[PDB]
mmCIF file of all heavy atoms in Angstrom:
data_model
loop_
_atom_site.group_PDB
_atom_site.id
_atom_site.type_symbol
_atom_site.label_atom_id
_atom_site.label_comp_id
_atom_site.label_asym_id
_atom_site.label_seq_id
_atom_site.Cartn_x
_atom_site.Cartn_y
_atom_site.Cartn_z
ATOM 1 N N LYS M 152 15.825 -5.017 -66.418
ATOM 2 C CA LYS M 152 15.194 -3.973 -67.267
ATOM 3 C C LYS M 152 16.268 -3.003 -67.764
ATOM 4 O O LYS M 152 16.305 -2.736 -68.983
ATOM 5 C CB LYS M 152 14.130 -3.226 -66.459
ATOM 6 C CG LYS M 152 13.274 -2.252 -67.256
ATOM 7 C CD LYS M 152 13.100 -0.918 -66.566
ATOM 8 C CE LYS M 152 14.382 -0.118 -66.483
ATOM 9 N NZ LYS M 152 14.997 0.077 -67.817
ATOM 10 N N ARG M 153 17.107 -2.495 -66.858
ATOM 11 C CA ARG M 153 18.144 -1.498 -67.238
ATOM 12 C C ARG M 153 19.077 -2.083 -68.306
ATOM 13 O O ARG M 153 19.482 -1.326 -69.200
ATOM 14 C CB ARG M 153 18.940 -1.059 -66.007
ATOM 15 C CG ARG M 153 18.756 -1.963 -64.798
ATOM 16 C CD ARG M 153 19.896 -2.952 -64.649
ATOM 17 N NE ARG M 153 19.498 -4.305 -65.006
ATOM 18 C CZ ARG M 153 18.437 -4.929 -64.508
ATOM 19 N NH1 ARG M 153 18.318 -5.094 -63.201
ATOM 20 N NH2 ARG M 153 17.500 -5.390 -65.317
ATOM 21 N N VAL M 154 19.421 -3.368 -68.198
ATOM 22 C CA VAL M 154 20.390 -3.969 -69.161
ATOM 23 C C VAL M 154 19.901 -3.680 -70.583
ATOM 24 O O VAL M 154 20.658 -3.056 -71.343
ATOM 25 C CB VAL M 154 20.580 -5.480 -68.932
ATOM 26 C CG1 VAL M 154 21.465 -6.100 -70.001
ATOM 27 C CG2 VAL M 154 21.127 -5.769 -67.543
ATOM 28 N N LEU M 155 18.677 -4.101 -70.917
ATOM 29 C CA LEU M 155 18.169 -3.923 -72.304
ATOM 30 C C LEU M 155 18.024 -2.428 -72.614
ATOM 31 O O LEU M 155 18.140 -2.063 -73.798
ATOM 32 C CB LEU M 155 16.849 -4.683 -72.472
ATOM 33 C CG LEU M 155 15.569 -3.882 -72.230
ATOM 34 C CD1 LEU M 155 14.818 -3.657 -73.532
ATOM 35 C CD2 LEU M 155 14.681 -4.587 -71.220
ATOM 36 N N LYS M 156 17.801 -1.599 -71.589
ATOM 37 C CA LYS M 156 17.730 -0.130 -71.813
ATOM 38 C C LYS M 156 19.125 0.367 -72.202
ATOM 39 O O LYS M 156 19.251 1.002 -73.266
ATOM 40 C CB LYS M 156 17.203 0.569 -70.555
ATOM 41 C CG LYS M 156 17.496 2.059 -70.460
ATOM 42 C CD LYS M 156 18.377 2.419 -69.283
ATOM 43 C CE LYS M 156 19.311 3.570 -69.580
ATOM 44 N NZ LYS M 156 19.793 3.540 -70.982
ATOM 45 N N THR M 157 20.132 0.065 -71.378
ATOM 46 C CA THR M 157 21.524 0.508 -71.661
ATOM 47 C C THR M 157 22.033 -0.167 -72.936
ATOM 48 O O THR M 157 22.830 0.467 -73.651
ATOM 49 C CB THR M 157 22.450 0.189 -70.483
ATOM 50 O OG1 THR M 157 22.363 -1.215 -70.235
ATOM 51 C CG2 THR M 157 22.092 0.951 -69.228
ATOM 52 N N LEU M 158 21.596 -1.402 -73.200
ATOM 53 C CA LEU M 158 22.071 -2.157 -74.390
ATOM 54 C C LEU M 158 22.138 -1.225 -75.604
ATOM 55 O O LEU M 158 21.095 -0.636 -75.950
ATOM 56 C CB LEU M 158 21.111 -3.319 -74.653
ATOM 57 C CG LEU M 158 21.613 -4.688 -74.205
ATOM 58 C CD1 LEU M 158 20.481 -5.696 -74.199
ATOM 59 C CD2 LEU M 158 22.733 -5.169 -75.107
ATOM 60 N N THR M 159 23.313 -1.116 -76.223
ATOM 61 C CA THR M 159 23.464 -0.274 -77.440
ATOM 62 C C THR M 159 23.628 -1.178 -78.665
ATOM 63 O O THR M 159 23.941 -2.368 -78.474
ATOM 64 C CB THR M 159 24.637 0.703 -77.303
ATOM 65 O OG1 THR M 159 25.741 0.007 -76.725
ATOM 66 C CG2 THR M 159 24.300 1.910 -76.454
ATOM 67 N N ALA M 160 23.434 -0.624 -79.865
ATOM 68 C CA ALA M 160 23.556 -1.411 -81.116
ATOM 69 C C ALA M 160 24.776 -2.334 -81.045
ATOM 70 O O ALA M 160 24.605 -3.553 -81.238
ATOM 71 C CB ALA M 160 23.646 -0.477 -82.297
ATOM 72 N N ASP M 161 25.956 -1.768 -80.783
ATOM 73 C CA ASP M 161 27.209 -2.566 -80.721
ATOM 74 C C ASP M 161 26.995 -3.835 -79.891
ATOM 75 O O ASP M 161 27.351 -4.923 -80.383
ATOM 76 C CB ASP M 161 28.346 -1.733 -80.131
ATOM 77 C CG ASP M 161 27.860 -0.725 -79.105
ATOM 78 O OD1 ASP M 161 27.380 0.348 -79.520
ATOM 79 O OD2 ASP M 161 27.952 -1.029 -77.899
ATOM 80 N N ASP M 162 26.442 -3.703 -78.685
ATOM 81 C CA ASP M 162 26.310 -4.881 -77.788
ATOM 82 C C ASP M 162 25.426 -5.960 -78.417
ATOM 83 O O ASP M 162 24.379 -5.605 -78.996
ATOM 84 C CB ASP M 162 25.772 -4.487 -76.410
ATOM 85 C CG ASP M 162 26.412 -3.236 -75.841
ATOM 86 O OD1 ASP M 162 27.632 -3.262 -75.595
ATOM 87 O OD2 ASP M 162 25.681 -2.251 -75.645
ATOM 88 N N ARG M 163 25.834 -7.227 -78.293
ATOM 89 C CA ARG M 163 25.012 -8.358 -78.794
ATOM 90 C C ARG M 163 24.432 -9.080 -77.577
ATOM 91 O O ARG M 163 24.911 -8.799 -76.468
ATOM 92 C CB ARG M 163 25.888 -9.327 -79.588
ATOM 93 C CG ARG M 163 27.377 -9.113 -79.376
ATOM 94 C CD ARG M 163 28.150 -9.136 -80.679
ATOM 95 N NE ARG M 163 28.945 -10.348 -80.796
ATOM 96 C CZ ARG M 163 28.439 -11.572 -80.871
ATOM 97 N NH1 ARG M 163 27.882 -11.989 -81.995
ATOM 98 N NH2 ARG M 163 28.486 -12.375 -79.821
ATOM 99 N N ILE M 164 23.467 -9.983 -77.775
ATOM 100 C CA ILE M 164 22.931 -10.784 -76.632
ATOM 101 C C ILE M 164 23.893 -11.942 -76.353
ATOM 102 O O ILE M 164 23.717 -12.613 -75.319
ATOM 103 C CB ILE M 164 21.507 -11.298 -76.914
ATOM 104 C CG1 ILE M 164 21.324 -11.706 -78.377
ATOM 105 C CG2 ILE M 164 20.470 -10.274 -76.481
ATOM 106 C CD1 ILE M 164 19.936 -11.443 -78.909
#
Side-chain angles (χ1 to χ4, degrees):
Chain M
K152 188 225 68 55
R153 15 99 253 308
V154 175
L155 93 110
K156 161 243 146 324
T157 57
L158 257 166
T159 43
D161 32 279
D162 316 297
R163 15 225 252 64
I164 37 214

